[PDB]
Design a protein around this ligand. Structure first.
Ligand SMILES: Nc1nc2c(ncn2[C@@H]2O[C@H](COP(=O)(O)OP(=O)(O)O)[C@@H](O)[C@H]2O)c(=O)[nH]1
Ligand SMILES: Nc1nc2c(ncn2[C@@H]2O[C@H](COP(=O)(O)OP(=O)(O)O)[C@@H](O)[C@H]2O)c(=O)[nH]1
Ligand SMILES: [Mg+2]
Ligand SMILES: [Mg+2]
Lengths: 181, 177
């Protein structure tokens, strides 16, 4: 299971996969498949300890955007050292899609990691109200990608509750970080 | 309705009520009965912004304890200037009552506001496995001395016990009593 995670484990460096999105998008449900164990990341400047996940040299940092607590410089503090970003959206939630779009663009336009590959996960594709990946790309202003620049990006439909598309989502991230490709 | 909130509005100072407890205890649900307006408290010196509920000179700050974030000096940073504390517990969750007890004692043994009144809210009393307020007192070892405290059973979904819970806090903050 996920044999290709060895493409990260074999490299002599530390990886951090930032997994962000609004609450209830499905981030925890999606990453539960990896069975990574809890790790504590200390942020001495802020004076806060953060519960993250880690297996060997790969750290998964999951964070709800638009929650009760916001970091003023998320990408310079909790997400410092980000190698790749997974932005998870609830594709069935049209009430929150404009907020999700707005949070996605705050990540894309942040100056800390402009070259970190970013995967949009269009989650909850099993629900009757689910937006297509084409509609998500249009609503997000990604049909004509110019503001994104040279950043590698992709969109993957998923059903995190069954695991549909989850292995393919992780594969895209690992492939973008694989020095052998 | 809640006419006694005027006992805070008519006092010439700012009040901050820290509303803390584990995630899913019922903090947001309990406070919705007040209809305060969502606002953003910015804290540039700590590096975070927080959602607060505001009405006139009263601010309510909700924070989930024992979750992903653990602040070293919560009562001197995020909850600085707390006038009163409301600690909400899911009384029906025996799987998390020991973590709630541990978080409560971390709050009690903290040196920032050792005398702001503290209300323990034993929420979800409507649920089948709900613990009594006496069993919560026994589990948490509350059977302090230098601090004003009370425990109130509530059903945040219907509002049962919520008026008495806010009433106790306002009475503790009311210099006209
Ligand atoms: N129908 C459906 N529900 C999902 C899916 N993924 C997650 N959920 C549910 O959405 C809710 C929020 O999921 P969670 O992983 O906690 O979200 P997070 O806050 O982004 O970590 C939970 O009730 C999940 O069971 C999905 O693909 N389809
Ligand atoms: N049965 C029952 N459910 C409750 C009660 N209070 C809250 N809930 C539910 O518990 C969940 C968590 O409540 P919420 O206000 O988000 O908790 P918070 O994280 O502490 O702010 C929601 O599904 C609420 O509807 C209660 O007194 N009884
Ligand atoms: Mg969440
Ligand atoms: Mg919460």
């Amino acid at each position: 299971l996920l044999s290709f995670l060895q493409r990260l484990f074999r490299q002599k460096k530390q990886f951090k996969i930032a997994v962000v999105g609004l609450d209830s998008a499905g981030k925890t449900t999606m990453l539960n498949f990896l069975r990574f164990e809890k790790n504590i990341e200390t942020l001495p400047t802020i004076g806060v300890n953060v519960e993250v996940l880690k297996r060997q040299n790969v750290n998964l940092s999951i964070f709800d955007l638009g929650g009760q607590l916001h970091f003023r410089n998320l990408w310079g503090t909790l997400m410092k050292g980000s190698s790749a970003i997974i932005f998870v959206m609830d594709s069935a939630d049209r009430y929150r899609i404009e907020e999700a779009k707005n949070e996605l663009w705050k990540v894309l336009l942040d100056p800390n990691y402009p070259d970190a590959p970013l995967l949009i996960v269009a989650n909850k594709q099993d629900k009757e109200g689910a937006m297509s990946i084409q509609e998500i790309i249009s609503v997000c202003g990604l049909d004509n990608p110019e503001k994104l620049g040279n950043r590698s990006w992709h969109i993957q439909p998923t059903v995190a509750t069954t695991g549909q598309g989850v292995e393919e989502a992780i594969k895209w991230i690992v492939m973008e970080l694989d020095k052998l490709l």
